[PDB]
Amino acid sequence: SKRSSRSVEDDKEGHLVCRIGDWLQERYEIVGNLGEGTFGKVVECLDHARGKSQVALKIIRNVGKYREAARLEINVLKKIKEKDKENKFLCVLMSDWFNFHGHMCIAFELLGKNTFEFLKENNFQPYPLPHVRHMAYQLCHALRFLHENQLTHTDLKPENILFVNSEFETLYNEHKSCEEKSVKNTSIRVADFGSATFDHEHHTTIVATRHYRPPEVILELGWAQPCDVWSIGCILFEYYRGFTLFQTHENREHLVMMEKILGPIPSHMIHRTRKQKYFYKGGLVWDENSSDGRYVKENCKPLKSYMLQDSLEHVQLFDLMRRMLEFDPAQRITLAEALLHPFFAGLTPEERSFHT
Ligand SMILES: O=C1N=Cc2ccc3c(-c4ccccc4)c[nH]c3c21
Q1: Could you tell me if the CB of 110 is within 6 A of ligand 1?
Q2: Which of 32, 251, 280, 343 fits a disulfide with 44 by CB distance 3.0 to 4.6 angstroms?
């Protein structure tokens, strides 16, 4: 079963050429393909060393900078693994890693669809509030654990949050004369630790996928754990309405959106930033008549107006979201404090105790 170097081949980009039935490490038998990315690909395997159980095996390209990145990812994942020996903090648990002819491979439990793919397959119809609450709780919990360990994820978004199981029932919406998929179990895991960064390491100027990037980062004021909290705020809005809070492609535009949605940037952050071009008279400067300006003006309104209903549940979700999307990161709610928010009184007990 041990593959000699003649049964191993890479495409031009350096991807391992894979086929169903191929073996790795005399242990993992490929039984399917789960997706591809810049880094490489993820395949489903049966782990024959463990009663044929299913795994997701992530295979990094055989390219210098990808392999080295992967080595940092493995360190993060090992620390998580060691600090959550009880399996209770909901970050993907690495079961094995190895170097396959220069491809770094990481083995995990096999999960379901990511929360973005589920949303897309539901035609961007949003998750119902109770699902939003359970998922938000799990996110606060998972990342409070990360933050306690001097780590920041830096790249949280819906595609990096995976359902344990994404089997659904199909329902019907009266109000919109269409079908709706509703996930049966809203248990989630936090994935993709490829950018996670220790407190002691070098902090690059820019982190996060744009739509999920906080103002401190755009303004280049430095960042830390508060970065993730902002991303979570953006994620919750997206789960609740089904569309991106900040559908943006440029910094000035992004800042205007923040202003229109959330109120004025604090002066103190404007005085502190070296990105003074975005400003004028201590005030954010932009062309309201440009394409981007007219887009922002048509489409970006006060945050509270996006509420779908007006009962307590919904009021509390918006209060938490507003606190998570506070401009000033030294004043933004922490996850420890987020877990005490009244929004979370509203959980079922199995949900809260993690009997889900
Ligand atoms: O089932 C899984 N358990 C862990 C895990 C991690 C990543 C993935 C991905 C994937 C695939 C392509 C790009 C990006 C991600 C699909 N399933 C995954 C799993």
Answers
A1: yes
A2: 32
Q: Is the CB of 191 under 6 A from ligand 1?
A: yes
The torsion of the CA quartet 257, 263, 125, 58, rounded to 10 degrees, works out to 70
Give the DSSP letter of residue 16.
B
Give every strand in the sheet of 40-47, ordered side by side.
23-24, 28-36, 40-47, 53-60, 103-109, 94-100
Instruction: Kindly provide the resolution of this structure in angstroms, with one decimal.
Output: 2.0
Please give the Cα distance from 226 to 330 (Å, whole number): 8
Instruction: For 108-121, give one letter per residue: b (16+ CB within 10 A) or e.
Output: bbbbbbbbbbbbee
How was this structure obtained?
X-ray
Handedness of CA 119, 122, 126, 131 (dihedral sign): negative
Q: Which atom of ligand 1 is nearest to the CA of 111?
A: 1
């119902």: which residue's tokens?
128
Q: Which two tokens stand for residue 264?
A: 């004025």
Which domains are present in the chain? 1-87+92-110 (3.30.200.20), 88-91+111-356 (no CATH)
Tokens of 270: 């404007």
Task: Using the atom order of ligand 1, give the atom closest to the CA of residue 110.
Answer: 1
Our answer to whether residue 155 is catalytic in this structure is yes
Do residues 261 and 218 lie in contact, with contact meaning Cβ atoms separated by under 8 Å? no
Q: Is 277 annotated as a binding residue?
A: no
